[PDB]
Structure 1
Amino acid sequence: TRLKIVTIHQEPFVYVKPTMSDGTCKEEFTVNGDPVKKVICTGPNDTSPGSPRHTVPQCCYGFCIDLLIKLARTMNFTYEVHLVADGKFGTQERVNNSNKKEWNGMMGELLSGQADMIVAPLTINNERAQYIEFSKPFKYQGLTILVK
Structure 2
Amino acid sequence: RTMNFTYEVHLVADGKFGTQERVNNSNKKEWNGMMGELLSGQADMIVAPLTINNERAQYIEFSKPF
The interval holding the TM-score normalised by the smaller chain is: over 0.9
1:59-112: CA deviation from partner (whole Å, max 9, x where unpaired): xxxxxxxxxxxxxx1001100001100121000111113720010100111111
Q: Which residue of 2 aligns with 1:112?
A: 40
Overall identity of the aligned pairs, in %: 100
Structure number with greater Rg is 1
Tell me the alpha carbon deviations over residues 99-133 of structure 1, each in whole angstroms, 9 at most, x when there is no partner.
20010100111111100000000101000001101
Q: Distance in 2 between the 1:87 and 1:80 partners?
A: 18
Q: Deviations over 1:18-38 (max 9, x none)?
A: xxxxxxxxxxxxxxxxxxxxx
SS of the aligned residue for 1:81 comes to: coil
- SS of equivalent residue, structure 1 residue 93: strand
Number of positions where the alignment pairs a residue of Structure 1 with one of Structure 2: 66
Bigger fraction of residues in strand: 1
Gaps of 5+ in 1: 1-72, 139-148
**Equivalent position of 2:57 in the other structure:** 129
Q: How many Å separate the matches in 2 of 1:90 and 1:115?
A: 14
Q: What residue ranges of structure 2 are gaps of 5+ in the alignment?
A: none
Taking structure 2 as the reference length, what is the TM-score of the superposition?
Answer: 0.93
Secondary structure of 2:47's counterpart equals strand
